[PDB]
Each structure stands twice: as structure tokens, then as C-alpha cells.
Design a protein around this ligand. Structure first.
Ligand SMILES: Nc1ncnc2c1ncn2[C@@H]1O[C@H](COP(=O)(O)OP(=O)(O)OP(=O)(O)O)[C@@H](O)[C@H]1O
Lengths: 296, 257
């Protein structure tokens, strides 16, 4: 920890502080994540065990790079590559200038590459949200915060229900599905996609029930034609109001026909029919993809 | 089948990377295959008492074997290693892991909590945090998707036999989880239905009945001698109706290979 000089505190989570730091010997700017160990009570936090072990298996240009783990008797510090800011902060700062479409498309192409890599190596992220996605000065974006990720199995089994941040939470989970897999992460990126475009949250529910109502008000209330098995889901209610699906021309007006088509496949009710990160990369929307540097 | 082929290929690669040293017991001046057998059988019992996943058990044995590939352990510490490993497998795999005090309680106060917490950290450091190991159970789960139709007895019997493999370092340390899984499935299928390692799995794994034969030879023997093994917790576990009483079934006298 001697090679490192703290520059500023850039964050705080449940098990310790986040720092911008600089390697005094190499000049490398990093993020230090400090994790307190419960030396007399619970030991190393189960969230840090998954996060470290999963992130060490995940070496891809669109996933935050874990550079080192520095042990002491009383702390862990995870050394991460430094990334300028999160997507939430960038969208917010872009209130008056907007975000260029080619930047939105490039970012989405990258998130999907990061995501296909995870799923390829049997990792669900389970907390995709703008706050958890990191951009640099040069036009790259990366999946970060692997605190809620887990290694899956084929076929999946019952995993933790209380998982995803509500606005990003897939309808199969909200209806208390026994099983969720890769499709839950595609949902969240669908929500992120529309939010990059409108720059407001697609479905900002107040609670689980309200979360569903908001989804149904936009996408149409699901039935058995569109989603075999909905009506037999544990938290399904035959009394749900029957809303007609709105035009995506109205849900995401700036979006072209290609983008609308992609958003629509990412936000398919039936998790089985919702597109894979792998398949989404082949969508015509990405035919003209470039890599703009953002104004920062 | 979303990423089914990508995942399988990647697991095949990763099992070689998390492979314990085949010859490590002979290099442990103070511990034996028989002591290791006692340890795992006890962990099987911890696994039943705390209603833990089967994958947690499998993960813990991988962790133990890798640790014991790297460090000399005295026999009075063998159990401290096994407990910390079960604890780390729990944190990794379980939705609701037992708390650390329960891990101390199961060793019936052989060690303190501090001991168990310091061992946990020593174990992480020795494994350099590489915890996401492929298991026999991971490969079996994938193989089960190549049934038509799924047969519950075949599945429970395949699990039972994959789990017996955990107990005996001789000879199972020389096979890869995917190989033990292939032996377990074929033998389980052949025992319930009379069928053989499906062509879909040969195309998947590139394992034929002949390449599976050495393991299958060993595993069949283990299946035959199971009622007379010193360690018995897995048999007792697999008589429960939860596993369709499959340890009460009779092994074939021949395989015909
Ligand atoms: N590598 C990094 N580069 C730049 N900023 C980072 C980095 N890691 C974390 N941050 C900052 O900290 C915030 C969140 O960090 P992160 O989500 O990794 O930790 P956390 O919230 O404590 O989650 P957990 O401890 O559960 O993994 C972000 O909004 C970001 O501003």
C-alpha cells in the first residue's frame, strides 16, 4: 500500500471506501476499493469473494480490469483501472447538450460485447444500471461493480430473488419466477438503452406492483399468446389492468426503425424469446457503429 | 441452449486450471488418503445437516485438494482446512450460507473462531481467490439436458456416484470432473434403463465409451464395494426419498465394454 498515494475519495459502499489513487512508482492512476474484513466475526464478505473470483476470470476490454488484490490481516484493497466517471453521471452532466446517437450506439455495442463475454464465461451480473457502468475519456464503456454477480450453471437453478435494482428489474423476477438466467441482464440493458436515448428512466416504479404497472402501460399487458406461462407465475394476478402496447415511435421518439427493432427484442416479456447479447451484436442497428470520444 | 456450447468449452478449459496435483498425498508427510476420506465424508454430513447445495460440497473438496497440493498440513489441522473450505464454498455458492459460528460449532470446539477466520484468509491467498471451479455436478447438470426424456432415477444415481468419487483421492484425483461426470452418467443410465453414453454427448464432449473406460472401470468398482466402504454418509444420504432411494439400487455385475 506504500506505492500508492490517495488523490481523492471517489466513493463509498457497504464494506468500505473507494479512492482515486496514483502509483508513485509507475504514474498509473487507479481506483482503490477498500474492503474491511470482520476479523473477529464473519471474515471475508461473501460479496467480495464472488466479486474478486469472478472478475479475475473476466478479461475483456469492456469489463473493468481488476489489476491487483492487496491483502493485510485487517483489510482487502482491490486495485482497479481508473475510469473517469459512471454513465449515470455522464447522462446527468449531458442535460443541456444531449448525447449524440453515434455515442449511444457505440456505448450499447460495447456493453453488449462486455455482456456476451460474461454470459459466455457463465457469469450473471445481476445489477446493470447506469451507476455501475464506467466510461473513459476516449469513448470506451465498461461493465463494473461485480458485487451481485454469480457464476451460473446449465441449466440455471434457483438463485437469490432480491437481486436487481427495481427500475432495471426484469418482469420474470417481479412475477417471482423460480428461475432466471442471462435474459435478466439483457432486460436491464434494454432499460439502459432507452434511458441513454430519452435520458430519463424507462420504468421508474415506486414498488414491485407499480414497477409491473409501468412496464405493462408501455409494452402492453402480457397474455399467454405473447408469453406462454405468464398467468401461472406465482405473483401473476388475473385482475391486472389490460393496457394496449404503445408505439415505440412515442416511447423512444429519437430512435430510428433499426434501434426500435433492437430495443423491442431486448424488452421481450418471454425471457426465452428476448434476444441474447451474442445475437444482438449481429443486429442491423450496429452496421454503421463507430467509436466517438464523448465531450467531457 | 443460449450459451450452452460457449459455457461447456470454457468449463473444459477451466477444469484443467483448477486441477489439483494427482500425486500430492505421497508428498504430505502426515496426512493420508484415508484421513482425507474421513474429512470429505464428514463434510457430506455437514452438507446434509445444514441443507447445503450439492455444488457447495463439490466446491469445498476442490478447495481442499488445491490447498493440500500447496501446503504441508499436520493431521490435527486437517479439519481446520476442511471447515474454512466449506465456509468459503458456502459464501461462494449459497443464497443463505451458515454463519461462521455454526462452522465453529460443527468442529465441536476443536478450533476457535479466530482460527477458522484466519484459515479462511490463508485458504483464499493459497487459491489466489480462484474459487469458481468446475465440478462433477456442473458437468452432470449439462449432460442431463441430453436425456430424452429426463429420468429422475438416472439423475439421482448419476449424482450419487459422482459424489462417491469425492471420497477416494485414489483413484479419482487423476480424472477431470468432466470425465468422472461422463462415467457417472453412463453408468447411471446403464444401471437404470440399460442405455449407453448418448451420441449427443459424444458429439458434445468428444468423449467416447472407450476414453471413458478407465474411469468407468474404477467407478463401477466403487459402486460394487460401496456397502463395505468405511465411509457411508453418501449412501445414507442417497437412501432419502429426496434422491429417490437410489443408493438402495443394485449395481450391474458387468458393463459389457
Ligand atoms: N475502477 C473505477 N474507476 C472509476 N470509478 C470507480 C471505479 N470503481 C468504483 N468507482 C466509483 O465508485 C462508485 C461505485 O463503485 P462500485 O460499485 O465498484 O463499489 P460499491 O458501490 O462499494 O459496490 P460493492 O462493494 O458491492 O462491489 C461509482 O459510481 C464510481 O464513481
Amino acid at each position: 500500500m506504500e506505492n500508492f498515494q490517495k488523490v481523492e475519495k471517489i466513493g463509498e459502499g457497504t464494506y468500505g471506501v473507494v479512492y482515486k489513487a496514483r502509483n508513485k512508482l509507475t504514474g498509473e492512476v487507479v481506483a482503490l476499493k477498500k474492503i474491511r474484513l470482520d476479523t473477529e466475526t464473519e471474515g471475508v464478505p461473501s460479496t467480495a469473494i464472488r466479486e474478486i473470483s469472478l472478475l479475475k476470470e473476466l478479461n475483456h476490454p469492456n469489463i473493468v480490469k481488476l489489476l491487483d488484490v492487496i491483502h493485510t490481516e485487517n483489510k482487502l484493497y482491490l486495485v482497479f483501472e481508473f475510469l473517469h466517471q459512471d454513465l449515470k453521471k455522464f447522462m446527468d452532466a449531458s442535460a443541456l447538450t444531449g448525447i449524440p446517437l453515434p455515442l449511444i450506439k457505440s456505448y450499447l455495442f460495447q456493453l453488449l460485447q462486455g455482456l456476451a463475454f460474461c454470459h459466455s464465461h457463465r457469469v450473471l451480473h445481476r445489477d446493470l444500471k447506469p451507476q455501475n457502468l464506467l466510461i473513459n475519456t476516449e469513448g470506451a464503456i465498461k461493465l463494473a461493480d461485480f458485487g451481485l454477480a454469480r457464476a451460473f450453471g446449465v441449466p440455471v437453478r434457483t438463485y437469490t430473488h432480491e437481486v436487481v435494482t427495481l427500475w432495471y428489474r426484469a418482469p420474470e423476477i417481479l412475477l417471482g419466477c423460480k428461475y432466471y438466467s442471462t435474459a435478466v441482464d439483457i432486460w436491464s440493458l434494454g432499460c439502459i438503452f432507452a434511458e441513454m436515448v430519452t435520458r430519463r428512466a424507462l420504468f421508474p416504479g415506486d414498488s414491485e406492483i407499480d414497477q409491473l404497472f409501468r412496464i405493462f402501460r408501455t409494452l402492453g399487458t402480457p397474455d399467454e399468446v405473447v408469453w406462454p406461462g405468464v398467468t401461472s407465475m406465482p405473483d401473476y394476478k388475473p385482475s391486472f389492468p389490460k393496457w394496449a402496447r404503445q408505439d415505440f415511435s412515442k416511447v423512444v421518439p429519437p430512435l430510428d426503425e433499426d434501434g426500435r427493432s433492437l430495443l423491442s427484442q431486448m424488452l421481450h416479456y418471454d425471457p426465452n424469446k428476448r434476444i441474447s447479447a451474442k445475437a444482438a451484436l449481429a443486429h442491423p442497428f450496429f452496421q454503421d457503429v463507430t467509436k466517438p470520444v464523448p465531450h467531457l | 441452449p443460449d450459451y450452452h456450447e460457449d459455457i461447456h468449452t470454457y468449463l473444459r478449459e477451466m477444469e484443467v486450471k483448477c486441477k489439483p496435483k494427482v500425486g500430492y498425498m505421497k508428498k504430505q508427510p502426515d496426512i493420508t488418503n484415508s484421513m482425507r476420506a474421513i474429512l470429505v465424508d464428514w463434510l457430506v454430513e455437514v452438507g446434509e445437516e445444514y441443507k447445503l447445495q450439492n455444488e457447495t460440497l463439490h466446491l469445498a473438496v476442490n478447495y481442499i485438494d488445491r490447498f493440500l497440493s500447496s501446503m504441508s498440513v499436520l493431521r490435527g489441522k486437517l479439519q481446520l482446512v476442511g471447515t474454512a473450505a466449506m465456509l468459503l464454498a458456502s459464501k461462494f455458492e449459497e443464497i443463505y450460507p451458515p454463519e461462521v459460528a455454526e462452522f465453529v460449532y460443527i468442529t465441536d470446539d476443536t478450533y476457535t473462531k479466530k482460527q477458522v477466520l484466519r484459515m479462511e484468509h490463508l485458504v483464499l491467498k493459497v487459491l489466489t481467490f480462484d474459487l469458481a471451479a468446475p465440478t462433477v455436478n456442473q458437468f452432470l447438470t449439462q449432460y442431463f439436458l441430453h436425456q430424452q426424456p429426463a429420468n429422475c432415477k438416472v439423475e439421482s444415481l448419476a449424482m450419487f456416484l459422482g459424489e462417491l468419487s469425492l471420497i477416494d483421492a485414489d483413484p479419482y484425483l487423476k480424472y477431470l470432473p468432466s470425465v468422472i461426470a461422463g462415467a457417472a452418467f453412463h453408468l447411471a443410465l446403464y444401471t437404470v434403463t440399460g442405455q449407453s453414453w448418448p451420441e449427443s454427448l459424444i458429439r458434445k464432449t468428444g468423449y467416447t465409451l472407450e476414453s471413458l473406460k478407465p474411469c468407468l472401470m474404477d467407478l463401477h468398482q466403487t459402486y460394487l464395494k460401496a456397502p463395505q466402504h468405511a465411509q457411508q454418509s453418501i449412501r445414507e444420504k442417497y437412501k432419502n426419498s429426496k434422491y429417490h432411494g437410489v443408493s438402495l439400487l443394485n449395481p450391474p455385475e458387468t458393463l459389457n465394454l
